[PDB]
Ligand binder design. Structure first.
Ligand SMILES: N[C@@H](CCC(=O)N[C@@H](CS)C(=O)NCC(=O)O)C(=O)O
Ligand SMILES: N[C@@H](CCC(=O)N[C@@H](CS)C(=O)NCC(=O)O)C(=O)O
Lengths: 206, 205
């Protein structure tokens, strides 16, 4: 078969989306989780000095979005047409811009930077969430299938669903008045093969 | 197929797509808005921002998604799915790089308060050194001269245009990277692209 090796830290973060893709494609792969010191040794042989890095039959591929998209195309979770795929691509990119806005809150609460959690929540996180959910909700209200794009699962369903499940861990109010976003999160994570992975994967915060 | 690129009267995020149409000899509507006309159309855009591309009325936002979509249509995305992915990662790396230098970039075009010189010497140049380190590595291991595979792909157009733009503000930008200089020249010498470079509206970025 094609052999796959996901290399990333001992956390979900940027590597998780790809791990969910393999779970849903029932695709077996090597799932390498590194500590700081192990990373420091392999780092210079990585295409951009960072992780996640995927290997397909030895050949290296960096950047989480590129990884997830590549794997989604192989297994049928990218979109059922080239334009639909592009629409999925834009949701993924929007989500990434959203991650930049909340970077300050997100790295404070995992505790790898110091700051005031509470005003970062109120002033940074929640306004960025309101804007972003405003867009997500619009795609959901105009999708009667229940997925963000088209009539089936695509990998942005997995990004947006996992992020929201993760954030409820730190901010229980997070999906406070957005029932359609709540619905989506539940719908996707109820897919038995995904739920299985959720139950069996190593438990990490974020 | 009718195409409509909507963006501001600048190159910035919209230019990559404009270069794709130039190279595909694809005619399209090229809509450049001022602040006040944007403010009026903004709420009907998918994420409230530009660039937005329309294919036969169907709206598509996010510059990377636009460029990749158009590249696939016209044959500039990569000649396999993995090669396309490798092109995707270069594009994404470049975008991370844009985040690092955001503070310098908006100060020097003068649409932001700033401390030019330490931003240049402490922010811009170290981010460039790291980024060019990667770009150079792809170039040294590419016998064709393009960042990926043996032909033009849309990241060639992003990286080439950004470097030409930055030389405008920082003339020492490419100095200790002749291979990056080469790449910039190689791509922008492609006649169809050079013709667009000579005929497009001149803007200060
Ligand atoms: N755009 C990159 C960002 C990922 C990233 O920054 N990962 C960090 C871990 S938090 C890394 O690999 N190294 C951190 C470092 O050494 O700077 C991606 O999606 O892979
Ligand atoms: N992250 C988006 C860029 C979206 C964006 O910030 N667009 C700018 C122009 S370069 C804009 O429209 N700014 C004004 C606004 O959001 O109202 C992309 O990757 O295309």
């Amino acid at each position: 078969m094609v052999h796959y090796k996901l290399t990333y830290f001992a956390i979900r973060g940027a590597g998780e989306c790809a791990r969910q893709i393999f779970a849903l494609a029932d695709q077996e792969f090597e799932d390498v989780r590194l500590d700081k010191e192990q990373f420091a040794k392999v780092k210079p042989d990585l295409p951009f000095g960072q992780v996640p890095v995927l290997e397909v039959d030895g050949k290296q591929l960096a950047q989480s979005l590129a990884i997830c998209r590549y794997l989604a195309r192989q297994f049928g979770f990218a979109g059922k047409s080239t334009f639909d795929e592009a629409v999925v691509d834009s949701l993924a990119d929007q989500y990434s811009d959203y991650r930049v806005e909340i970077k300050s809150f997100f790295y404070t609460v995992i505790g790898m930077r110091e700051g005031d959690v509470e005003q970062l929540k109120k002033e940074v996180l929640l306004p960025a969430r309101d804007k972003f959910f405003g867009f997500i909700t619009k795609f959901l209200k105009k999708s009667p299938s229940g997925f963000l794009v088209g009539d089936s699962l695509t990998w942005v369903d997995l990004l947006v669903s996992e992020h929201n499940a993760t954030m409820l861990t730190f901010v229980p109010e997070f999906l406070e008045g957005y029932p359609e976003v709540k619905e989506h999160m539940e719908k996707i994570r109820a897919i038995p093969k995904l739920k299985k992975w959720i139950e069996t994967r190593p438990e990490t915060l974020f």
